[PDB]
Write an enzyme that holds these catalytic residues in place. Structure first.
Site, PDB file in Angstrom:
ATOM      1  N   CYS A 362       2.114  -5.638   4.813  1.00 52.06           N
ATOM      2  CA  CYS A 362       3.570  -6.060   4.828  1.00 52.06           C
ATOM      3  C   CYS A 362       3.425  -6.813   6.317  1.00 52.06           C
ATOM      4  O   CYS A 362       2.905  -7.679   6.234  1.00 52.06           O
ATOM      5  CB  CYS A 362       5.045  -5.384   4.601  1.00 52.06           C
ATOM      6  SG  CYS A 362       5.068  -4.161   5.828  1.00 52.06           S
ATOM      7  N   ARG A 367       6.468  -0.898   4.446  1.00 51.68           N
ATOM      8  CA  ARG A 367       7.241  -1.056   3.171  1.00 51.68           C
ATOM      9  C   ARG A 367       5.620  -0.593   2.315  1.00 51.68           C
ATOM     10  O   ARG A 367       5.557  -0.425   1.442  1.00 51.68           O
ATOM     11  CB  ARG A 367       6.936  -3.044   2.477  1.00 51.68           C
ATOM     12  CG  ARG A 367       8.644  -3.179   3.056  1.00 51.68           C
ATOM     13  CD  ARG A 367       8.668  -4.159   2.707  1.00 51.68           C
ATOM     14  NE  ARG A 367       7.983  -5.014   3.785  1.00 51.68           N
ATOM     15  CZ  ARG A 367       8.644  -6.384   4.205  1.00 51.68           C
ATOM     16  NH1 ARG A 367       9.269  -7.262   2.916  1.00 51.68           N
ATOM     17  NH2 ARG A 367       7.696  -7.229   5.042  1.00 51.68           N
TER      18      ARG A 367
END
Ligand code: NA
EC number: 2.8.1.1
Length: 412
Positions: A362, A367
């Site tokens: 990411c 994430r």
């Protein structure tokens, strides 16, 4: 008002209907409701916990119905606690489903249930609390265990309240400038010793945001901690259960000098840029962007300090959230992990598959760490995080970049 005729699983199958498991996802995932009790849900059952209903608007429910392909007159058979079954019946009735029954023989044959292959890696508050009080629990840590709150920077909200006996980890202990990549093996060794973690210490991490805890977790797995687990849905699930809290600065930890294996014991869990680039354009591998759709198409970089916009060319979209600090596509309304079935289908449509070598990235890896831990718990065997992510990729204007709206085919 009332329910149609009760159906057995067999009849429901014959009638091309769907089963709806109305328990909390923890139990849907595999956690027994009593010690030694049935583990998991009925074959292809959907999960619609009654406890989510107050956080699903009319249109969220309609969307969820469509998304699980419930045809309006096709039989739906519910199971779980009575109050829950009844709360879901009402809601599905108001949404316009016309054939709602109970699944009469639900949970009656333990040998036919389906579970998250490693559901024990995603704990829930009551399990954690039972463990703390010394209660025999399913999947008990084999030896020592520790509970740790992970968050960015010095303790803040932790000082106000935290899980009892929880230690605290500032994420700056595991990653650092210039690339926001993990710190060195040597710094990791010291971080581990300092927090009294050896390779066979079970570590249970939680955060105010799931991904801070996941970031720490994937890094510890890389280092060599065998048994690392997350509180499913984070701190909020603990707060909401109204369970005991402690307060004040983290108590002194007894150092563990010797980790007991050489760090890193699982280096394959982290990819550098070249290795990540190697996964592109393959049937047997996927490099997965866990970035929002505006990041994925190049409307925005997602970050104040990242000037370049666009995406890794050939990255397959793994979904994410509305922006760079949210993960709605992986969450139930209570913040826990969506069903494995749903995640598997969402990823499949983009040709991301469990038999592949799969690496998530990411912005800088938080994430992706979150989806990594889900994939680990779903039993995906060849998963990793590409640490550098878009921040490192777009540093080199030679790296191929994609922008614009495009679908699954465009990442063959
Ligand atoms: Na990174």
């Amino acid at each position: 008002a009332e329910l149609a005729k009760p159906l057995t699983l067999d009849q429901l199958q014959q009638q091309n209907g769907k089963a709806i498991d109305t328990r909390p996802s923890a139990f849907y995932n595999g956690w027994p409701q009593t010690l030694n009790g049935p583990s998991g849900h009925e074959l292809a059952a959907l999960n619609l916990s009654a406890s989510w209903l107050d956080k699903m608007s009319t249109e969220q429910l309609n969307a969820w119905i469509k998304q699980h392909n419930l045809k309006t007159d096709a039989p739906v058979a519910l199971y779980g606690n009575d109050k829950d079954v009844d709360a879901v019946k009402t809601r599905l009735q108001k949404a316009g489903l016309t054939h709602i029954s109970i699944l009469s023989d639900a949970l009656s044959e333990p040998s036919r249930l389906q579970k998250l292959p490693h559901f024990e890696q995603l704990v829930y508050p009551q399990w954690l609390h039972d463990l703390q009080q010394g209660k025999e629990v399913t999947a008990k840590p084999a030896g020592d265990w520790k509970v740790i709150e992970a968050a960015w920077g010095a303790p803040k909200l932790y000082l106000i309240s935290h899980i009892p006996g929880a230690d605290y980890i500032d994420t700056n202990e595991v990653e650092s400038e210039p690339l926001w990549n993990k710190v060195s093996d040597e710094q990791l060794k010291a971080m581990l010793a300092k927090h009294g973690i050896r390779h066979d210490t079970t570590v249970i991490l939680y955060g105010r945001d799931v991904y801070a805890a996941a970031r720490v977790a994937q890094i510890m797995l890389y280092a060599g901690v065998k048994d690392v687990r997350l509180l499913d849905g984070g701190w909020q699930t603990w707060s909401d259960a109204g369970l005991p809290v402690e307060r004040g600065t983290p108590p002194k930890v007894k150092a563990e000098p010797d980790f007991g294996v050489k760090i890193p014991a699982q280096p394959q869990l982290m990819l550098d840029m070249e290795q990540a680039r190697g996964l592109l354009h393959r049937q047997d591998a996927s490099l997965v962007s866990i970035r929002s759709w505006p990041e994925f198409i190049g409307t925005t970089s997602g970050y104040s300090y990242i000037k370049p916009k666009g995406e890794i060319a050939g990255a397959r979209w793994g979904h994410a959230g509305s922006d760079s600090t949210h993960m709605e596509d992986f969450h139930n309304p209570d913040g826990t992990m969506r069903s494995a079935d749903d995640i598997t289908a969402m990823w499949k449509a983009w040709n991301i598959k469990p038999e592949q070598q799969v690496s998530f990235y990411c912005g800088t890896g938080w994430r992706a760490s979150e989806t990594f831990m889900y994939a680990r718990a779903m039993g995906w065997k060849n998963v990793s995080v590409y640490d550098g992510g878009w921040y490192e990729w777009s540093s080199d204007p030679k790296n191929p970049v994609a922008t614009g709206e495009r679908g699954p085919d465009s990442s063959k």
